[PDB]
Ligand binder design. Structure first.
Ligand SMILES: O=C(O)COc1c(C(=O)O)sc(-c2cccc(NC3CCN(S(=O)(=O)Cc4ccccc4)CC3)c2)c1Br
Length: 297
């Protein structure tokens, strides 16, 4: 049980040891397609690739590769697409995937520039007057509106399939203060953001899977998804004792390597889930508390 286990690991200092065990046991499947010579310029990191069995395939005969995996949580009944931050040459691919997979929401847990590095291309329009057109995949993207908060921004976008003139609204959730290789300021600010994603309907089973990305699509993205899945499992059974975080984390790693980069990110997962359980189990006031504590205004 997660709260006694958390106090146990903390009391010792075995978060490094605990975290390492996950790396030692994680699933190791082939990533043949991602390692093909022609896809070298489609991967941001040499050591972070999608497994062939769970990779998202683009619907085009030319090259159907994109560095993204489909994390399908059977028991929880919720899917995500975890992908790397789009490269200058893969933004078209990125939006093709969003469209083909019927995604309604896109979560961005990083900033374009972190520690002096360009962690992600500017794949979305920053001003309504200047929409973006991806000639390679034939899609248009327009900024419709945005709600800027102290540490995250929510953008309303419109994606048009230029070929069929079809249109869809895409909600963009940009967490701007989650440090790379780090953890959120507090469980409150994290959960406030997550619930913002939840309340938008983007995680609904009536849409395609939500697309989640930071830079490599495994560290911060993994932390976010693990916390969401754990709270969902718990929710489905209304029994926080039946949720084994490490077990579910392992299960997520069958669909994409390296989910959760650091021992502290894992420690924070526990933290976030433990706090989120309050809401899951009936506490109707915590939500607002999180909003206050997050200082979004
Ligand atoms: O968002 C963040 O918090 C940080 O984001 C980032 C980055 C960023 O924002 O700059 S770079 C990065 C990164 C890049 C290359 C390799 C590894 N790390 C390796 C470690 C070992 N693993 S693994 O998956 O544990 C290896 C393995 C594969 C299958 C089975 C067992 C082990 C692969 C990635 C990490 C991560 Br994540």
């Amino acid at each position: 049980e997660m709260e006694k286990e958390f106090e146990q690991i903390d009391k010792s200092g075995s978060w490094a040891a605990i975290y390492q065990d996950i790396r030692h046991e994680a699933s190791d499947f082939p990533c043949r397609v991602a390692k093909l010579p022609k896809n070298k310029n489609r991967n941001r990191y040499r050591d972070v690739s999608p497994f062939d069995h769970s990779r998202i395939k683009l619907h085009q005969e030319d090259n159907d590769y994109i560095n993204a995996s489909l994390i399908k949580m059977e028991e929880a009944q919720r899917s995500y697409i975890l992908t790397q931050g789009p490269l200058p040459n893969t933004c078209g691919h990125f939006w093709e995937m969003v469209w083909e997979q019927k995604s309604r929401g896109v979560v961005m847990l990083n900033r374009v520039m972190e520690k002096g590095s360009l962690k992600c291309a500017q794949y979305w329009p920053q001003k309504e007057e200047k929409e973006m057109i991806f000639e390679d995949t034939n899609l248009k993207l327009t900024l419709i509106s945005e709600d800027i908060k102290s540490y995250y921004t929510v953008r309303q976008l419109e994606l048009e399939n230029l070929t069929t003139q079809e249109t869809r609204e895409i909600l963009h959730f940009h967490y701007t203060t989650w440090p790379d290789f780090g953890v959120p300021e507090s469980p409150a600010s994290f959960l406030n953001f997550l619930f913002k994603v939840r309340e938008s309907g983007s995680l609904s089973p009536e849409h395609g899977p939500v697309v989640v990305h930071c830079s490599a699509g495994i560290g911060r993205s993994g932390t976010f998804c693990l916390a969401d899945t754990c709270l969902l499992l718990m929710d489905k059974r209304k029994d926080p004792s039946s949720v084994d975080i490490k077990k579910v984390l392992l299960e997520m790693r069958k669909f994409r390597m390296g989910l959760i980069q650091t021992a502290d990110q894992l420690r924070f997962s526990y933290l976030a889930v433990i706090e989120g359980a309050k809401f899951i189990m009936g506490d109707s006031s915590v939500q607002d508390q999180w909003k206050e504590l997050s200082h979004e205004d």
